[PDB]
Amino acid sequence: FVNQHLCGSDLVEALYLVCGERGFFYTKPT
C-alpha cells in the first residue's frame, strides 16, 4: 500500500487485517 510504519500493536493490526481467514500467527509483541 502507501507509506505505513507499524511498531507492535499496530503491526498485529496489519497482521489481523492481512490474514483475515487464511490464518495468522505471531510471537510476542513489543
Place this chain on the structure above:
Amino acid sequence: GGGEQCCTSICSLYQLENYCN
C-alpha cells in the same frame, strides 16, 4: 519496542502475508 521489522523500515501486504498461514 523490541524485535520490530515493519516499524523503522517499510514492508508491504506481502511481508504481512508471510506471517499468516
